[PDB]
Amino acid sequence: GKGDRRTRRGKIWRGTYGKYRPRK
Amino acid sequence: GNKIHPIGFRLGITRDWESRWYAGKKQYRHLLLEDQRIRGLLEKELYSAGLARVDIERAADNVAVTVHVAKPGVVIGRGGERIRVLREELAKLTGKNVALNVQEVQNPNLSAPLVAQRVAEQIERRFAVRRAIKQAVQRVMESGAKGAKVIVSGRIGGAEQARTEWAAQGRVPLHTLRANIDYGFALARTTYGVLGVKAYIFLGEV
Amino acid sequence: EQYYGTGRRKEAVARVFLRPGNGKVTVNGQDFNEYFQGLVRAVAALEPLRAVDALGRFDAYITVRGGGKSGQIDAIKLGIARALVQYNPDYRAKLKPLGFLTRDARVVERKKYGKHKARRAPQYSKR
Amino acid sequence: KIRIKLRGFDHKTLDASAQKIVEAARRSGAQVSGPIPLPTRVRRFTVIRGPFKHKDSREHFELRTHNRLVDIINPNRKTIEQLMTLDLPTGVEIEIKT
Amino acid sequence: SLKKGVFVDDHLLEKVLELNAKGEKRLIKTWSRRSTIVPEMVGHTIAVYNGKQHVPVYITENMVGHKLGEFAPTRTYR
Amino acid sequence: ARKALIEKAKRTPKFKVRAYTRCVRCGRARSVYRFFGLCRICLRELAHKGQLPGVRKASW
Amino acid sequence: ARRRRAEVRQLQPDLVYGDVLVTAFINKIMRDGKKNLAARIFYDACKIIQEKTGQEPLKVFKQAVENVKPRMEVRSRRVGGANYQVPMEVSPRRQQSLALRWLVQAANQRPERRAAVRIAHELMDAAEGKGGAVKKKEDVERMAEANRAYAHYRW
RNA sequence: GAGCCCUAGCACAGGUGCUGCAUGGCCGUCGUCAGCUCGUGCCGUGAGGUGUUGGGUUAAGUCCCGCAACGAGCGCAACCCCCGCCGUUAGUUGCCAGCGGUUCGGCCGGGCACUCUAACGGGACUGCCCGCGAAAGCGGGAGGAAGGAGGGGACGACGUCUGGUCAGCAUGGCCCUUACGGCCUGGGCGACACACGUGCUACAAUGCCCACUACAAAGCGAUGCCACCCGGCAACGGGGAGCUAAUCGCAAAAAGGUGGGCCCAGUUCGGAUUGGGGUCUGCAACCCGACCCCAUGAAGCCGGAAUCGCUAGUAAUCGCGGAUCAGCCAUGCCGCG
Ligand SMILES: [Mg+2]
Ligand SMILES: [Mg+2]
Ligand SMILES: [Mg+2]
Ligand SMILES: [Mg+2]
């Protein structure tokens, strides 16, 4: 989970946005 | 090494700040650096006066410096040719218009920062610590005080072993917030090293 | 025509408004079971009624704001209770026994320095 | 409708200083909409107590900007009398608007 | 890693371009290990400083795009 | 070094990257709170004296 | 507990059968304070007791527990030398504690993939009196008997 | 040869050079432990003792009773802050709560009721009842938001550890004064056969993925937050409105709830490692930045001997913010819920 850049959860944890969690 | 600075501890009640001016992230920073170098030069070339507090109020290009002393006639000059040069030394570096009030301590034996300063003085004139302390407390206790205490830290009498003398009288409820305890810290450069003086004087209540 | 008690519980505040007669319950312009949608405990918020016998015979319009859901459930539980004591000083001696009437002071205790977490303390290794 | 903001580190000398600004506007103007307290912007500092290596144990310092607000519905000079200079605010500030 | 220039140092280029009018010098020693190896100005050998000394690095085609520092390692037995 | 250094940190240098802070009294590099140009120590110091206004003993 | 006796922390009645014993058991199911998810499980599991037997869940439940309460157990003890597994009567409050704890542990030892099932089949296997909970319970009781020789040390 | 600025000398500068066993200051620690004392009287040749001990009681040397002591001081408690309940003052944040217009967004007239915001007060006292007690007090019951220190802070006695720190700073001594000062460029503090501490992320079905779905609780932002448009799978790049910010923005809360997928597998668990293409900040990202997307997908199936935390809104678990700060190696810390 939190370790995976390419998950939603990954993104949240990491602070970032992108393809795997967009900004709406 | 425990024990809070008993002014810090009292800022809410029993003790106000020595800079009462408002500001905001933009210039608070320099309204400080200047603000300080002021009480900087002041403390040095005003020693002889013997200065307790040194409040400061502000409101943009005015600055109500209020040097408290017990030797007012030393800030002044003859009619006023010291106090003239100084309000001019202030505006020298400060790009501002310097109000420069003066106040007096009715009793300098209730002004801890002096009581300390006093004891420091004696120390540099190779005096007798234990006694100085002994007297200073008495002096203070004499002039109406509800309790008081003084600490010299260490290297007493030139001793290789640093030590710590202290004497106390009346109350000094340091844990009671509603105290009103002037605190003052004199330094004391000697030939063989720094000692440190701490003066406490207790007055207040309800 | 109208009845009010304020409930609070841990950041969450309840605006409760009782009206006579019915059974339905608005919360924040939403049906009760629509707001607390399959959250097992919600059925609890209206337990003050069940205890007085006004199980159904009141309508309720509700605002509820503050932090989080399960608190709100309890917040209401006070509103409801307070609101209906102010429709009957006689609604004391039955609600107080089960005390739906006590605010409940228990807040997040505060994170302290040196600890990890208020009480949870760091990990000692000794050797 | 003259509307004024007042900031301040000192919660006492605002409810004090900028609420004489309600006498000198009901006594000399007409209608006032009383003092309104804006929530506060609390800047905090966390400082490690010792000069060296004592990472647990520090001390907590706040710097709290209080915010008060005043509304009056009277743009006349029967008011702007006291309400330009008639002082008792010393660590305060003013926002002037309508 | 950029895409708006190849942040290569003036002082070095100046010295390469001006060597690019019949210029085949080895004596060429830089300190800008930070500068990109730039499209085709190869053939030469550049002495790159590693913090202790410059190093005879021969520069070939297969090795463009890389920085100079990549060829002058800074620490010992690795 | 801490002098040729307290000094050097005053020159606006080539490239602004090199621009660092420094406790304006206790003349010092690290933990420099920007709202005060003050090193966490030479800072807890003045605060205790009340020489930084509004600044206070926090407690909740 | 140096000063006091500590009050048996008092629990909030089951908002669905009205039973303190149930909440207790719901809490023991709970992980990281997911009380919602926990109750889903207990109830979905009561679902799976109708769908499988004629009688009432609250009844299977009460009963399963009853069978899993141990009556004696060994408490360890200092003597001049090494230690002694000393059998002694198990207090009612603890009986309860152990039962529930064991039911939940035994449950998540079972093979079926979904929690509510595991909880249910274990509850079922218990009132019939043959779950792995009732097992690790006769193990205690038996072991307190093995050590019947040292029952002259009970405080 | 006024000041200023140059080169040659001079008095001096500079030193994060040594000594925390010369020091100040500040901190840690036993320890928020229930203690450490003094004045006078008294006892003892004296060091000292009595007081402070004893019986009851407290969280406490807290109070009660007793007593050659009777009182004080630094402690404890209280005086201060936050969190619970209620009131007064106050209306760009609250609402049909009540009514009307609503393009059906508290948006618009309109009102502060309520919620909140923040100032000030009230409230709890063993005050009340029963039982035990000589008393302090203990156990229980009432009423009350709260009951016996209601909950969390701030607050650290006399002293101890020749504790810590001369590299924050201050300082005695000592030592270098075309160099132990200074300036720069580059390297280093990031090395890696190993070994420990503290953490993070896991080893999965009470789970993982993708979708839809306001439950908001501290804080920060005008060389900033950046809505909203458009380009791009995205990082981000154009544009570009609003806020000196209870008004605008960061901002998505996440765990949850609903739907669907995976079906027990080293897997749709886990995301290490490596290849590649890019984005940004920055003079500059080789040594040595973070971020996006494609590929690659490691060890890990819950951990020996040991061993750590926590007694309730605590532990566990889920996100949110901030300080330093160009960017960032933050999984750290300080805080929110
Ligand atoms: Mg030492
Ligand atoms: Mg020291
Ligand atoms: Mg050392
Ligand atoms: Mg030592």
What domains can you pick out in chain B, each with its CATH number? 16-106 (3.30.300.20), 107-206 (3.30.1140.32)
Answer yes or no: are the C-beta atoms of B11 and F57 closer than 8 Å: yes
Alpha-carbon span B163 to B193, nearest angstrom? 13
Nearest-CA neighbor of C72 among C24, C1, C3, C6?
Answer: C6
User: Residue with structure tokens 């006070």?
Assistant: C78
Q: Which domain holds residue G120?
A: 1-155
Q: Does domain E1-78 have CATH number 3.30.860.10?
A: yes
The answer to whether some atom of strand H lies closer than 7 Å to the beta carbon of D9 is: no
Alpha-carbon span B115 to B150, nearest angstrom? 9
Q: How many CB atoms lie within 10 A of CB B64?
A: 16
Alpha-carbon span B31 to B63, nearest angstrom? 10
Q: How many CB atoms lie within 10 A of CB A19?
A: 7
Q: Which two tokens stand for residue F5?
A: 């250094």
Alpha-carbon span C42 to C60, nearest angstrom? 15
Strand H bases, protein C-beta under 7 A: 14-17, 22-31, 59, 72-86, 89-98, 114-120, 143-146, 150-157, 159-160, 163-165, 167-173, 181-189, 191-192, 196-202, 205-211, 215-223, 233-236, 244-246, 251-258, 263-264, 269-272, 278-287, 289-294, 297, 307-320, 322-326, 331, 333-337
Q: How far is the CA of E1 from the centre of ligand 2 (A)?
A: 51
Q: Kindly report the CATH number that applies to the domain delimited by D1-98.
A: 3.30.70.600
Nearest-CA neighbor of F54 among G129, D41, G60, B30?
Answer: D41
Burial class, C21, CB count within 10 angstroms (exposed 0-12 / middle 13-18 / buried 19+): exposed
Nearest-CA neighbor of G31 among G83, G104, G86, G100?
Answer: G104
Q: How far is CA C11 from CA C34, C68, C101, G63, in A?
A: 22, 8, 18, 42
Q: How many CB atoms lie within 10 A of CB F48?
A: 21
Strand order in the sheet with E45-49: E29-30, E45-49, E54-58
Q: What is the resolution of this structure in A?
A: 3.1
Q: Among positive and negative, which fits the CA dihedral G119, G121, G124, G126?
A: negative
Burial class, F2, CB count within 10 angstroms (exposed 0-12 / middle 13-18 / buried 19+): exposed
Alpha-carbon span G17 to G20, nearest angstrom? 9
Say how far C96 CA is from H130 C1', in Å.
22
* Angle made by CA atoms E11, E15, E21, in degrees to the nearest 5: 155
Q: Say whether B143 sits in a helix, a strand or coil.
A: coil
Within its chain, how far is the Cα of F1 from the centroid? 18
Alpha-carbon span G34 to G30, nearest angstrom? 6
Q: How many CB atoms lie within 10 A of CB B2?
A: 3
Q: How was this structure determined?
A: X-ray
Answer yes or no: are the C-beta atoms of B137 and B131 closer than 8 Å: no
User: Residue with structure tokens 């009732």?
Assistant: G134
Hey, which chains touch F, using 3+ CB pairs under 8 Å?
B, D
Alpha-carbon span E68 to D20, nearest angstrom? 73
Answer yes or no: are the C-beta atoms of F49 and B16 closer than 8 Å: no
Alpha-carbon span B69 to B102, nearest angstrom? 8
Alpha-carbon span E17 to E40, nearest angstrom? 11
Q: Say whether C80 sits in a helix, a strand or coil.
A: helix
Nearest-CA neighbor of E48 among E58, E38, E62?
Answer: E58
Exposure b/e, B178-188, CB count within 10 A at least 16 = b:
ebbbbbbbbeb
Domain residue ranges in chain C = 1-127
Within 8 A by CB and 6+ apart from E66, the residues are E36, E37
Alpha-carbon span C69 to C9, nearest angstrom? 10
Q: Look up the CATH architecture of domain F1-60.
A: Irregular (4.10)
Burial class, C111, CB count within 10 angstroms (exposed 0-12 / middle 13-18 / buried 19+): exposed
Say how far C31 CA is from H96 C1', in Å.
19
Nearest CA in chain F to B5: F48
CATH topology of domain C1-127: Ribosomal Protein S5; domain 2 (3.30.230)
User: Residue with structure tokens 């109830």?
Assistant: G43
Within 8 A by CB and 6+ apart from B150, the residues are B115, B116, B119, B133, B136, B137, B166, B167, B168, B197, B198, B199, B200
Alpha-carbon span C94 to C72, nearest angstrom? 23
Pairing of strands C58-65, D2-8: unpaired
In one letter, which amino acid is B15? Answer: R
Q: How far is CA F52 from CA B18, B55, B156, D27, in A?
A: 8, 12, 34, 38
Alpha-carbon span B134 to B154, nearest angstrom? 16
Q: Which two tokens stand for residue B65?
A: 């410096």
Q: What is the CATH number of the domain that holds G112?
A: 1.10.455.10
Q: Among positive and negative, which fits the CA dihedral C71, C76, C77, C78?
A: positive
D46 vs C contacts (CB less than 8 Å): 113
Alpha-carbon span B65 to B59, nearest angstrom? 12
CB–CB contact F47 D61 (8 Å): yes
For chain B, report the end-to-end CA distance as a whole number of angstroms. Answer: 30
Say how far B31 CA is from H233 C1', in Å.
52
Answer yes or no: are the C-beta atoms of D56 and D17 closer than 8 Å: no
Q: How many residues does chain G have?
A: 155
Query: Do chains D and B touch, with touching meaning 3 or more CB–CB pairs less than 8 Å apart?
Result: yes
The residues that bridge with D97 in the sheet, in sequence order, are D3
B59 vs D contacts (CB less than 8 Å): 90
Q: Give how far D48 is from chain F: nearest CA, Å.
A: 7
Q: Which two tokens stand for residue B107?
A: 């009793």
Answer yes or no: are the C-beta atoms of C19 and C77 closer than 8 Å: no
Q: Give how far C114 is from chain D: nearest CA, Å.
A: 4
The one-character DSSP state at E37 is P
Q: Which two tokens stand for residue B67?
A: 């040097």
In one letter, which amino acid is C5? Answer: G
Alpha-carbon span G104 to G123, nearest angstrom? 9
Exposure b/e, C50-76, CB count within 10 A at least 16 = b:
ebbebeeebebbbebeeeeebbbbbbb
Alpha-carbon span B189 to C3, nearest angstrom? 76
Q: How far is CA G29 from CA B3, B57, G96, in A?
A: 49, 64, 15
Say how far E78 CA is from H192 C1', in Å.
8
Structurally, how many domains does chain G consist of?
1
Q: How many CB atoms lie within 10 A of CB C96?
A: 13
F41 to chain B, any CB pair closer than 8 A? The answer is no
Alpha-carbon span C54 to G33, nearest angstrom? 33
Answer yes or no: are the C-beta atoms of G42 and G26 closer than 8 Å: yes
B21 vs F contacts (CB less than 8 Å): 53
Within its chain, how far is the Cα of E78 from the centroid? 23
| Ligand number nearest to the C-alpha of D53 | 3
Answer yes or no: are the C-beta atoms of D13 and D87 closer than 8 Å: no
Q: What are phi and psi of B194, to 5 degrees?
A: -65, 140
Alpha-carbon span G11 to G20, nearest angstrom? 6
Exposure b/e, B76-111, CB count within 10 A at least 16 = b:
beeeeebbeebbebbeeebeeebebeebebeebbbb
In one letter, which amino acid is G109? Answer: Q
Q: Say whether B49 sits in a helix, a strand or coil.
A: helix
Answer yes or no: are the C-beta atoms of B194 and B187 closer than 8 Å: yes
Alpha-carbon span F30 to F21, nearest angstrom? 8
Alpha-carbon span G121 to G132, nearest angstrom? 11
| Rg of chain G (C-alpha set) | 18
User: Residue with structure tokens 């700040």?
Assistant: B17
C39 vs G contacts (CB less than 8 Å): 36
The residues that bridge with C3 in the sheet, in sequence order, are C18
Determine which helix (DSSP H) or strand (DSSP E) holds B74, and give its type and residue range.
helix B73-76
Determine which helix (DSSP H) or strand (DSSP E) holds C50, and give its type and residue range.
helix C47-52
Alpha-carbon span B18 to B51, nearest angstrom? 13
Exposure b/e, D57-92, CB count within 10 A at least 16 = b:
ebbebbbbbbbbbbbbebeeeebeeebeeeeebebb
Answer yes or no: are the C-beta atoms of B172 and B198 closer than 8 Å: no
Answer yes or no: are the C-beta atoms of E69 and E33 closer than 8 Å: yes
Burial class, C82, CB count within 10 angstroms (exposed 0-12 / middle 13-18 / buried 19+): buried
Domain residue ranges in chain E = 1-78
F39 is in an annotated binding site: yes
Q: Which two tokens stand for residue G64?
A: 């399963």
The 3-class secondary structure across D58-81, one letter per residue, is EEEEEEEEEEEEEEECCCCCCCCC
Determine which helix (DSSP H) or strand (DSSP E) holds B133, and give its type and residue range.
helix B129-142
Answer yes or no: are the C-beta atoms of F46 and F38 closer than 8 Å: yes
